[PDB]
Amino acid sequence: GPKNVSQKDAEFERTYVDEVNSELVNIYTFNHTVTRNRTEGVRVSVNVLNKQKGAPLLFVVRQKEAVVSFQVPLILRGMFQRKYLYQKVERTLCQPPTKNESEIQFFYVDVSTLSPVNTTYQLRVSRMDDFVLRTGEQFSFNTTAAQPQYFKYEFPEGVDSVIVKVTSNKAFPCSVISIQDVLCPVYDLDNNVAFIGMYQTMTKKAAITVQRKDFPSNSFYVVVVVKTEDQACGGSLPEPVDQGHRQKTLSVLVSQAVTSEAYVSGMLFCLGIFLSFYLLTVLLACWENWRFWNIATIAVFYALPVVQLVITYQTVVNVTGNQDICYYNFLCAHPLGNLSAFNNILSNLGYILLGLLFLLIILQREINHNRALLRNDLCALECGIPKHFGLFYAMGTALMMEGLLSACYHVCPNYTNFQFDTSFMYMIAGLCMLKLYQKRHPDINASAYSAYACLAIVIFFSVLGVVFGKGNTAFWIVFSIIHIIATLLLSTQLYYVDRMVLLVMGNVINWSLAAYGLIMRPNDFASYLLAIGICNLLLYFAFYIIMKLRSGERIKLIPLLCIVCTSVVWGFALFFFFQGLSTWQKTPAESREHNRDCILLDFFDDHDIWHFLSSIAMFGSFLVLLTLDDDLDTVQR
Amino acid sequence: GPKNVSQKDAEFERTYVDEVNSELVNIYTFNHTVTRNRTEGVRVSVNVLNKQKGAPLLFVVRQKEAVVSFQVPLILRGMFQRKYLYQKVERTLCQPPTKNESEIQFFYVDVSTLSPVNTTYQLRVSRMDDFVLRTGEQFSFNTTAAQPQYFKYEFPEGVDSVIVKVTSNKAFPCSVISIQDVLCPVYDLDNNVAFIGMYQTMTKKAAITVQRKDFPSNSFYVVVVVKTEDQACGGSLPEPVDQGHRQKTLSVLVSQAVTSEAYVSGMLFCLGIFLSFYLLTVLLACWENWRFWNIATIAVFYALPVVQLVITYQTVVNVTGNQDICYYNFLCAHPLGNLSAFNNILSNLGYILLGLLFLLIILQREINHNRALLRNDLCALECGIPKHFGLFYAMGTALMMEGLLSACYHVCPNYTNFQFDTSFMYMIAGLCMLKLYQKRHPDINASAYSAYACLAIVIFFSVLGVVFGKGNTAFWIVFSIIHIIATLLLSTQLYYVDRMVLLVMGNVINWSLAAYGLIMRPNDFASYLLAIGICNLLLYFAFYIIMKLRSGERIKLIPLLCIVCTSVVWGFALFFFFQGLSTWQKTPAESREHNRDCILLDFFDDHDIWHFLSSIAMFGSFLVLLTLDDDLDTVQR
Ligand SMILES: *[C@@H]1O[C@H](CO)[C@@H](O[C@@H]2O[C@H](CO)[C@@H](O)[C@H](O)[C@H]2NC(C)=O)[C@H](O)[C@H]1NC(C)=O
Ligand SMILES: *[C@@H]1O[C@H](CO)[C@@H](O[C@@H]2O[C@H](CO)[C@@H](O)[C@H](O)[C@H]2NC(C)=O)[C@H](O)[C@H]1NC(C)=O
Ligand SMILES: *[C@@H]1O[C@H](CO)[C@@H](O[C@@H]2O[C@H](CO)[C@@H](O)[C@H](O)[C@H]2NC(C)=O)[C@H](O)[C@H]1NC(C)=O
Ligand SMILES: *[C@@H]1O[C@H](CO)[C@@H](O[C@@H]2O[C@H](CO)[C@@H](O)[C@H](O)[C@H]2NC(C)=O)[C@H](O)[C@H]1NC(C)=O
Ligand SMILES: *[C@@H]1O[C@H](CO)[C@@H](O)[C@H](O)[C@H]1NC(C)=O
Ligand SMILES: *[C@@H]1O[C@H](CO)[C@@H](O)[C@H](O)[C@H]1NC(C)=O
Ligand SMILES: *[C@@H]1O[C@H](CO)[C@@H](O)[C@H](O)[C@H]1NC(C)=O
Ligand SMILES: *[C@@H]1O[C@H](CO)[C@@H](O)[C@H](O)[C@H]1NC(C)=O
Ligand SMILES: *[C@@H]1O[C@H](CO)[C@@H](O)[C@H](O)[C@H]1NC(C)=O
Ligand SMILES: *[C@@H]1O[C@H](CO)[C@@H](O)[C@H](O)[C@H]1NC(C)=O
Ligand SMILES: [Zn+2]
Ligand SMILES: [Zn+2]
């Protein structure tokens, strides 16, 4: 008729080996003492032995204000109707903050089974002394898919933001690191975990900025969960299948985030240099002298897509809390307002102020030229090299529009959102091809449409590469061969001592870039083709310099200095562009094992320094084009 | 020392009124008999009475192969640290499919509390006889936030796809309708629910297509959950707060989906008419006679964004199962392959074949014109009206590109993804303004750039309206006044009997459209401005006809027929364009209470008929422009 019920008084830190059957139920009564100030965490471990296939043990932990219950061997879901089985289950117990200063709290563990044979479990309830996290101290722990871990941080006084950094040494147990408030329960199951709070799938790295304003209890729970499968982290997979051998050893560090002097140090470093250029130029001019809207039209046909998509799409995460959508550099992302990576946006102040200053140069030069025309001298276009500021204006505005088309990319950098930032750098890379060429020929408008078509073709090839973002080896070699063919065909179009010497030093760099693209197989294709863009640009600059050099004229120092400085800055910028060029892989999990701290002035990482050197180098090359054949203001041949 | 444990034998369909305290535990033992063929569902209801604030009851349902456990009064989360409290909790019990043909199965209900005073619950375990769903039979039920319901469907033989339709009568309890397989457990909690399966937040309507290939058990569970708050369905909100009065009365119907004859009936109806046009024209021509890439360049600058974004973004849902992302017409969406709304994509076969046929017309006419030029007659441009097929080619290709720019919108129609489909209809609406105008003037290229700028300005206003998609009343009235100002300014530019009579019938329709835009305040702005586009287009056509009518010439019938037929088809198309024009609101929940069944041939809804009549009307108007001033091939004044 009735069952045996064995009610017994148990203790902490003492393994209990008992056994139950279909007609026995074991009820253990643990107690402890909780204190207002110091907190502690009970963790229950249960482990059946040589378990039979009949019926699981069923465990119930009853507290004053919550009930937890599971069934051991725990069975978790695969993906395509697969089941994984764990002989060993553990959970920490959520307990609401205490009211009294110290009190005694009980809780009972109920073990029962419906299997008609004995089963020998192994209960053990243990106190946790490393529950609370401390600011700046690394701390390790192990957790399988059946043993979700969680710890508790609470902000000190005067810390209004921290950043949680979790880092494992191996890649293929997956994980989720959620950060929730301290209101029980705690969603730390494979299904509950993504319900609230901000989470991040991790493979080797995870980082989450947390702010005090979110949590009125001045604390939060860091919850670490390990997934049954590694598909969502790039891995591959081959009735229940035993999977109790798969741990993950982690390390959690919670350090304070920059307060306010980083912000001002970022502004007062953008403004303190990009205005240095302004003053330098305006003071140089006095010494020297006293000793239509097509770009914006295309940008407006693209902007409402870019602007609306990115603005709406950031808010989606900002209201969701799923940080696997936008591919920031989470170690260096210092949010202001609703902007997550604020520094990745000031870093585009260069392009803006530099395109603007280039325009303000061209304006003055054009009106000076028309005033000198009103002086009625023979140096209209014969004694000089025919002036056409129409394309200089184009460069000076395209730089401005680049300082906006990527400042919107760096709001949710993403797989789809990519081509915005770097494709617009081909346009400005194309114009330098035009003007230089145009600087030796009367009509280029017939080839201007062809240049627009060539840029569109490059963008289409970039789109194709982005579509096959997992580009096969055949994919890579196909582009390799077609680009070598393009180089070989382009060598002919430029046809002596140095005329053919150019080809000696061109094909080698073509091969070198292709070889690195093949061997690295970088996930990024457009930003890789950009490297070829700059390489061709610099080679063309050098070649035109060489051809100008086989005439008995003399280059004035004022542009020669520009050539050398622009070359050196392009030396820097490609370095900081290759440091981050592999830092973007398929899945946000391993697109996160390439992050890195803020390098310069606590606020800017690599990419934020490339957003600087790129603008300064391109401005330097603009001035090179403006002033390169400047000395030829007398010869009318 | 030890507790009282009262183990008792209970029965189904019999309310149990008992009471427990800190030192009593009640264990009820229910049993039943399960059969291989017929299935049934146990549903437990528990209801504490006049509950005190101390400590909840804790309930545990232990079965052979699963453990469920909750705590009554159940407390669920608000949004900003709010708690809602339910004195009444129910759950159905998942039980795995039985092995034997019939067997006896036990399960125990454990009720216990840690409160040191009596608490009077009310247990009741009831069998469910309407667990299994049947194909084609409506069925109702009630469910609060604490009582998640779920039922079981299993496909018959010969049904490889069904569509679940759930429809409530009131709007502000929210819901989630998940559809999962029949492997226990069943995720029917506010946190588990979105873990697997395909779900849909509902307010008044929900529909989910389900296919047999997904489920190897030839069955699935429909799970209905009611949310604590209505924020994610457009509603607004004002220690635990009692919320036990908020039900939701639903109705679930699971009907078979179209097998294959709908698909062929859709193709053989697109091909059976858009080729009727082909044969009609090619046979008309014999009787009558025997009795550069700018559009594609803009489309390519937009396509890789459109193509890549939409293709990637459909797969996101297709691998997620969260159907609150893409705004289909779920009642009419007949998927093929990975395409959800396949019919919404064939419906753009018109634009393709009709733009193509228009081009093939223009080609023949141009070569006929050049051959006639080789005949060396005086009717070069004087005796006729100056021929320039350059813009006719533009229309004939822009229609093709519209049959692709919206056929990609109708893959995940969305808030961001919108402007693709209808903005490209302004371009073709603009060209008809040009050519007609161009048909009376020698130079329009000076105003061609202005027309491009005007279209860009309209697109920018559309983008601004889309950004403020929740446009305020001040927003609407601002556009109202500025558009009336635009109409008043445009009236002057066209300056008699009828010259000023035109203005009498123009401002009235301007006011009428503005008034309907204000009163309805449609969520869609660009597609609303399109109505003004067609209205202005038709008025301009009529006006040019009137001015041609005050000359003593005679319009040939061949274009006059075209005028009248194009007018009537534009009569139809605007009707089907207004039937779906409010069917797109802010949230996918209520963007779903405007769906409707497939109207024509089991396969096409309203919007799929507008994708037809729009193409045919625009093609008709193209031929009107081509043939309108055709008779003037003799007059050289
Ligand atoms: C609360 O603590 C433990 C439960 O783990 C119970 O066990 C004994 O407690 C006494 C002190 O009160 C000590 O002898 C030991 O800590 C325990 N006994 C042994 C043999 O180790 C204790 O009785 C519990 N108290 C109540 C009121 O339940
Ligand atoms: C987590 O990592 C391992 C998981 O196996 C735990 O056991 C250690 O494993 C390696 C090799 O056996 C060594 O680090 C030690 O010899 C093992 N520890 C022993 C035997 O006690 C390891 O203890 C765990 N580390 C924690 C919890 O900090
Ligand atoms: C299984 O069924 C019920 C539990 O609801 C138990 O109760 C009695 O069953 C007998 C028939 O076996 C009938 O008299 C009634 O259905 C129940 N009694 C009364 C007074 O209504 C039954 O004993 C259970 N059997 C076992 C073996 O547990
Ligand atoms: C679900 O709807 C109501 C929820 O209150 C249930 O009760 C009915 O409510 C209205 C007004 O009282 C009427 O339809 C009936 O008079 C009520 N039913 C009664 C008194 O039995 C209703 O029963 C539920 N319908 C179901 C479960 O089908
Ligand atoms: C437990 O079961 C045994 C026999 O199985 C019986 O003698 C005893 O009375 C039961 N109850 C106990 C030990 O409390
Ligand atoms: C502490 O003691 C009990 C413990 O719950 C309860 O009365 C209350 O929380 C506190 N009361 C006093 C008087 O401190
Ligand atoms: C099962 O467990 C009980 C509890 O100790 C034990 O007495 C018994 O011998 C075991 N084996 C069987 C067959 O009951
Ligand atoms: C239940 O408690 C009562 C007193 O509270 C005691 O007399 C009895 O022995 C206990 N056990 C039962 C009724 O099984
Ligand atoms: C039916 O009876 C029991 C019930 O579990 C078990 O042996 C098995 O499921 C079936 N056995 C036979 C012989 O049918
Ligand atoms: C509490 O419940 C028990 C169980 O019936 C009852 O005997 C008792 O009178 C109730 N009240 C108190 C104060 O114990
Ligand atoms: Zn960038
Ligand atoms: Zn459409």
Amino acid in position A113: T
Alpha-carbon distances, residue A440 vs A366, A399, A541, B143 (angstroms): 20, 24, 13, 80
Q: Which residues line ligand 3 (CB under 6 A)?
A: B 9, 11, 30-31
Q: Which residues contact B375 (CB under 8 A, 6 or more apart)?
A: none
Q: Is B511 on the interface with A (CB under 8 A)?
A: no
A68·B69 Cβ contact <8 A: yes
| Technique behind the model | cryo-EM
CA A419, CA A406: separation in Å to the nearest integer? Answer: 9
Q: Which residues contact A79 (CB under 8 A, 6 or more apart)?
A: A229, A231, A237
Compute the CA torsion angle B308, B310, B312, B314 (nearest 10 deg).
Answer: -160
Alpha-carbon distances, residue A339 vs A161, A164, A254, A314 (angstroms): 15, 19, 22, 8
Triad A475, A479, A481: Cα angle to 5°: 115
Spatial CA neighbour of B588 closest among B528, B523, B500: B523
Helix and strand totals (H; E) in chain B: 12, 18
Task: Give contacts of A77 with chain B, Cβ < 8 Å.
Answer: 183, 196
Ligand 12 ion local residues (Cβ < 5 A):
B 406, 421
Task: Give contacts of B453 with chain A, Cβ < 8 Å.
Answer: 293, 297
Q: Is A300 on the interface with B (CB under 8 A)?
A: yes
Q: Is B322 on the interface with A (CB under 8 A)?
A: no
Resolution number, Å: 3.2
A302·B301 Cβ contact <8 A: yes
Interface contacts (A, B; CB < 8 Å): 151
Query: Per-residue DSSP letters for B314-330?
Result: HHHHHHH-BTTSS---T
Domain A1-129 -> CATH class: mainly beta
Distance in Å, alpha carbon of B243 to nearest chain A alpha carbon:
20
CA B635, CA B637: separation in Å to the nearest integer? Answer: 6
- Determine the 3-state secondary structure of A25 from DSSP: strand
Q: Which atom of ligand 3 is nearest to the CA of B29?
A: 4
Task: Give contacts of A401 with chain B, Cβ < 8 Å.
Answer: none
B242 Cβ inside 6 Å of ligand 9: no
Instruction: List the 51-80 stretch of B: residues with Cβ below 8 A of A.
Output: 55-56, 58-60, 62-71, 77
A48, two tokens:
């059946």
Q: Is A38:A154 a contact under the CB 8 Å cutoff?
A: no
**Three-class SS string for A564-626?**
HHHHHHHHHHHHHHHHCCCCCCCCCCHHHCCCCCCCECCCECHHHHHHHHHHHHHHHHHHHHH
Task: Give contacts of A452 with chain B, Cβ < 8 Å.
Answer: 297
B58·A67 Cβ contact <8 A: yes
User: Starting at the edge strand that comes first in sequence, how are the strands of the sheet with B43-47 ordered?
Assistant: B88-92, B43-47, B124-126
Pick the CATH number of B1-128 from 1.20.1600.10, 3.90.1140.10, 2.60.120.380, 1.10.3470.10: 2.60.120.380
Task: Give contacts of A114 with chain B, Cβ < 8 Å.
Answer: 62-64, 106
If one counts every other C-beta atom within 10 angstroms of the C-beta of residue A330, the result is: 21
CA B225, CA B133: separation in Å to the nearest integer? Answer: 17
B416·A312 Cβ contact <8 A: yes
Which of A71, A117, A470 should be substituted to probe chain B, the one whose Cβ sees the most B Cβ atoms within 10 Å?
A71
Q: Which atom of ligand 9 is nearest to the CA of B99?
A: 9
If one counts every other C-beta atom within 10 angstroms of the C-beta of residue B44, the result is: 20
**Burial of B49 from C-beta contacts in 10 A (0-12 / 13-18 / 19+):** exposed
Amino acid in position B562: C
Q: Is B64:B72 a contact under the CB 8 Å cutoff?
A: no
Instruction: Name beta bridge partners: B7.
Output: B27
Triad B196, B197, B201: Cα angle to 5°: 100
Spatial CA neighbour of B121 closest among B177, B65, B64, B70: B70
CA A194, CA A360: separation in Å to the nearest integer? Answer: 53
**Burial of B338 from C-beta contacts in 10 A (0-12 / 13-18 / 19+):** exposed
Q: What letter does residue B16 receive in the DSSP assignment? A: B
Instruction: List the 130-189 stretch of A: residues with Cβ below 8 A of B.
Output: 181, 183, 187
* E strand spans, A63-138: 67-72, 74-77, 83-86, 88-92, 102-113, 124-126
CA A460, CA A464: separation in Å to the nearest integer? Answer: 6
Amino acid in position B436: L
Instruction: Name beta bridge partners: A91.
Output: A44
Instruction: Name beta bridge partners: B33.
Output: B104
Beta strand A4-9 with A24-35 is parallel
Fold matches, B1-128 and B130-257: yes
Task: Give contacts of B231 with chain A, Cβ < 8 Å.
Answer: none
Residue nearest to atom 1 of ligand 6 (CA): A100
Domains of chain A: which residue ranges? 1-129, 261-471+521-627
Ranges of H-type helices in A101-166: none
Alpha-carbon distances, residue A276 vs A279, A563, A602, B107 (angstroms): 5, 20, 22, 80
Alpha-carbon distances, residue A118 vs A20, B67, B597 (angstroms): 6, 19, 59
Residues preceding chain discontinuities in chain A with C to N over 2.5 Å: 238, 291, 495
CA A118 / ligand 7 centre spacing (Å):
6
Tokens 């051959």 correspond to B371
Q: Is B396:B355 a contact under the CB 8 Å cutoff?
A: yes
Alpha-carbon distances, residue B258 vs A478, B90, B219 (angstroms): 44, 37, 19
**Burial of B157 from C-beta contacts in 10 A (0-12 / 13-18 / 19+):** exposed
Instruction: Name beta bridge partners: B209.
Output: B163
Residue nearest to atom 10 of ligand 7 (CA): A118
The minimal CB distance from A308 to the residues B3, B307, B467 is found for B467
CA dihedral over B427, B429, B430, B431, signed as positive or negative:
positive
Percent helix, strand and coil across chain A, each to the nearest 5: 40, 20, 40
B354, two tokens:
């009709």
Q: Which atom of ligand 1 is nearest to the CA of A12?
A: 5
Instruction: Name beta bridge partners: A59.
Output: A70, A111
Q: How many CA atoms lie within 13 A of A183 on its CB side?
A: 16
CA dihedral over A158, A161, A167, A172, signed as positive or negative:
positive
Which of left, alpha, beta for A262 (phi over 0: left; psi -120 to 50: alpha)? Answer: alpha
Q: Which residue of A has its CA nearest to B53?
A: A65
Q: Is B9:B75 a contact under the CB 8 Å cutoff?
A: no
Spatial CA neighbour of B73 closest among B240, B277, B205: B240
- Determine the 3-state secondary structure of A205 from DSSP: strand
CA A429, CA A534: separation in Å to the nearest integer? Answer: 7
B335, two tokens:
């998927």
Q: Is B459 on the interface with A (CB under 8 A)?
A: yes
Ranges of H-type helices in A31-140: none
Q: What letter does residue B190 receive in the DSSP assignment? A: T
Q: Is A415:A469 a contact under the CB 8 Å cutoff?
A: yes
**Burial of B100 from C-beta contacts in 10 A (0-12 / 13-18 / 19+):** exposed
If one counts every other C-beta atom within 10 angstroms of the C-beta of residue B196, the result is: 17
CA B220, CA B206: separation in Å to the nearest integer? Answer: 17
Tokens 């253990």 correspond to A28
CA A88, CA A60: separation in Å to the nearest integer? Answer: 15
CA A104, CA A430: separation in Å to the nearest integer? Answer: 76
Q: Which residues contact B310 (CB under 8 A, 6 or more apart)?
A: B408, B409, B411, B412, B417
CA A221, CA A96: separation in Å to the nearest integer? Answer: 12
CA A489, CA B607: separation in Å to the nearest integer? Answer: 50
A500, two tokens:
């053919």
Pick the CATH number of B130-257 from 2.60.120.380, 3.30.365.10, 2.160.10.10, 3.40.50.10860: 2.60.120.380
CA B29 / ligand 3 centre spacing (Å):
10
